[PDB]
């Protein structure tokens, strides 16, 4: 299996790696931050350091068009995507794609559902049992993005535990053909659902979409629409789960910023940032293209190849954060790779932060006593090159706050 090179050897993507990827990250940054890896499907580089990430976000000639990797005797006939979502592609049809949804996702519109992500929350606090187990990351971390993307969208309740499933195979290390059919089944429900929604249309964002695309197909193909509706998904079901989970088990690791955060609690939001900062729930950006050579550490990758930005490595770079291995939650929060850069930056990025501060705050309020019920050593994470996120929580609730 993979190890870093260099004076200190520790697994990577394998072993010791999905436990706490940190050190390793550290090895990469400082021995080695271009670095190909030869994993199982094929080789893929990883940059670590933050001069590098943040810059490579906004180099075209790391492209998300996959037919990069083809000779151009082979690019002709080829789609420009395994899927029309819009983090799949370039300009210019990134640009049209992302300026139509992102007028869903405007700064008023987001923060009208700070309510009713309150009320989602409490009715979750209200429903743990005082002392017996509970996994905080199926009973709570998990179903606030969910319920919340349910309901922004439009999807029924009852298909929940359905395309939650397809959901998942799809960010982990599930083989190629695994990721394959549950793409499929999630593509031909969305199509049927969308089809129902003509004919019945609600006030949510999947049936605000479908009327574009029937008024304006160039604006936005049915296919798109589809691909658009499954993308607002997977990203519902992913990723601020482990913003909440990381974020709530950083605290319960760290009693001194607990403690801070139980005497301000308006601390929540600049929490989160470092949250994000500290243990980043997308480790590594979904890849990218080389459509030439490039350059970055003194280390050239060909034309053809695939590249990771190392988000979770970047975002603890001392070069950047100092002291970045320490926890505060009270630093003045800025820049930072955890949401992207430029143009794929998170569309999501207002919604994650209100659910995150409104998750964490209300559980830490509710219950002041929270506490792990296994070991640190004995938490199990998910196997992702995606995202940082626990597979379970093991948690004893302890009493309601008075
Ligand atoms: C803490 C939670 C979240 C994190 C850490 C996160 C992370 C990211 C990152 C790093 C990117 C850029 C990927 C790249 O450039 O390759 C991205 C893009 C994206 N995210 Fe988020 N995300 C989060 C929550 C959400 C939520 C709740 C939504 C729901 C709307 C969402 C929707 C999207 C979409 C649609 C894109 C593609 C944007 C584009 O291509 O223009 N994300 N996210
Ligand atoms: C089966 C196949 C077929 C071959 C593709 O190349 C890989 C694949 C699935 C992986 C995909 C396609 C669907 C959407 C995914 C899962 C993206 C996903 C929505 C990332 C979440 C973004 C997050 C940072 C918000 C990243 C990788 C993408
Ligand atoms: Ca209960
Ligand atoms: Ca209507
Ligand atoms: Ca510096």
């Given at each position: 299996?993979?190890?870093?090179?260099?004076?200190?050897?520790?697994?990577?993507?394998?072993?010791?790696?999905?436990?706490?990827?940190?050190?390793?990250?550290?090895a990469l940054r400082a021995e080695d931050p271009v670095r190909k890896l030869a994993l199982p499907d094929g080789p893929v580089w990883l940059l670590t350091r933050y001069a590098d990430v943040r810059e490579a976000f906004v180099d075209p000639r790391l492209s998300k068009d996959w037919r990069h990797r083809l000779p151009e005797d082979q690019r002709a006939d080829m789609?420009?995507?395994?899927?029309?979502?819009?983090?799949?592609?370039?300009?210019?049809?990134?640009?049209?794609?992302?300026?139509?949804?992102?007028?869903?996702?405007?700064?008023?519109?987001?923060?009208?559902?700070?309510?009713?992500?309150?009320?989602?929350?409490?009715?979750?606090?209200?429903?743990?049992?005082?002392?017996?187990?509970?996994?905080?990351?199926?009973?709570?971390?998990?179903?606030?993005?969910?319920?919340?993307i349910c309901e922004l969208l439009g999807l029924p309740a009852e298909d929940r535990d359905d395309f939650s499933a397809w959901s998942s195979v799809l960010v982990d290390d599930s083989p190629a053909d695994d990721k394959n059919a549950a793409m499929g089944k999630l593509h031909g429900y969305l199509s049927d659902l969308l089809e129902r929604k003509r004919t019945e249309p609600d006030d949510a964002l999947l049936s605000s979409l479908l009327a574009v695309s029937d008024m304006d197909g160039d604006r936005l193909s049915q296919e798109?629409?589809?691909?658009?509706?499954?993308?607002?998904?997977?990203?519902?079901?992913?990723?601020?789960?482990?913003?909440?989970?990381?974020?709530?088990?950083?605290?319960?690791?760290?009693?001194?910023?607990?403690?801070?955060?139980?005497?301000?609690?308006?601390?929540?939001?600049?929490?989160?940032?470092?949250?994000?900062?500290?243990?980043?729930?997308?480790?590594?950006?979904?890849?990218?293209?080389?459509?030439?050579?490039?350059?970055?550490?003194?280390?050239?990758?060909?034309?053809?190849?695939?590249v990771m930005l190392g988000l979770a490595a970047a975002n603890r770079d001392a070069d950047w954060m100092p002291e970045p291995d320490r926890?505060?939650?009270?630093?003045?929060?800025?820049?930072?790779?955890?949401?992207?850069?430029?143009?794929?930056?998170?569309?999501?990025?207002?919604?994650?932060?209100?659910?995150?501060?409104?998750?964490?705050?209300?559980?830490?309020?509710?219950?002041?006593?929270?506490?792990?019920?296994?070991?640190?050593?004995?938490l199990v994470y998910r196997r992702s090159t995606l995202v940082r996120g626990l597979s379970r929580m093991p948690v004893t609730m302890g009493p309601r706050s008075a």
């Amino acid at each position: 299996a993979l190890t870093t090179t260099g004076t200190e050897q520790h697994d990577l993507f394998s072993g010791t790696f999905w436990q706490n990827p940190h050190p390793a990250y550290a090895a990469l940054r400082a021995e080695d931050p271009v670095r190909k890896l030869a994993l199982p499907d094929g080789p893929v580089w990883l940059l670590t350091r933050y001069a590098d990430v943040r810059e490579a976000f906004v180099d075209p000639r790391l492209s998300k068009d996959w037919r990069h990797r083809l000779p151009e005797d082979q690019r002709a006939d080829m789609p420009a995507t395994p899927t029309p979502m819009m983090i799949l592609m370039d300009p210019p049809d990134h640009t049209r794609l992302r300026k139509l949804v992102g007028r869903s996702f405007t700064v008023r519109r987001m923060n009208e559902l700070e309510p009713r992500i309150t009320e989602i929350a409490d009715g979750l606090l209200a429903g743990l049992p005082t002392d017996g187990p509970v996994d905080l990351m199926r009973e709570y971390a998990f179903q606030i993005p969910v319920q919340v993307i349910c309901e922004l969208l439009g999807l029924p309740a009852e298909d929940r535990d359905d395309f939650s499933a397809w959901s998942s195979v799809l960010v982990d290390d599930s083989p190629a053909d695994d990721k394959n059919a549950a793409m499929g089944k999630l593509h031909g429900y969305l199509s049927d659902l969308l089809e129902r929604k003509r004919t019945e249309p609600d006030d949510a964002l999947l049936s605000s979409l479908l009327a574009v695309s029937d008024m304006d197909g160039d604006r936005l193909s049915q296919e798109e629409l589809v691909a658009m509706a499954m993308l607002l998904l997977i990203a519902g079901h992913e990723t601020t789960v482990n913003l909440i989970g990381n974020g709530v088990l950083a605290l319960l690791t760290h009693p001194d910023q607990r403690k801070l955060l139980a005497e301000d609690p308006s601390l929540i939001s600049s929490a989160v940032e470092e949250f994000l900062r500290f243990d980043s729930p997308v480790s590594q950006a979904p890849i990218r293209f080389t459509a030439e050579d490039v350059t970055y550490s003194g280390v050239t990758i060909p034309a053809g190849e695939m590249v990771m930005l190392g988000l979770a490595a970047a975002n603890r770079d001392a070069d950047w954060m100092p002291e970045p291995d320490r926890l505060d939650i009270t630093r003045d929060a800025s820049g930072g790779v955890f949401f992207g850069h430029g143009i794929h930056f998170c569309l999501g990025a207002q919604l994650a932060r209100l659910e995150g501060r409104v998750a964490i705050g209300r559980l830490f309020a509710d219950r002041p006593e929270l506490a792990l019920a296994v070991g640190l050593d004995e938490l199990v994470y998910r196997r992702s090159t995606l995202v940082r996120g626990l597979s379970r929580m093991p948690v004893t609730m302890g009493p309601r706050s008075a």
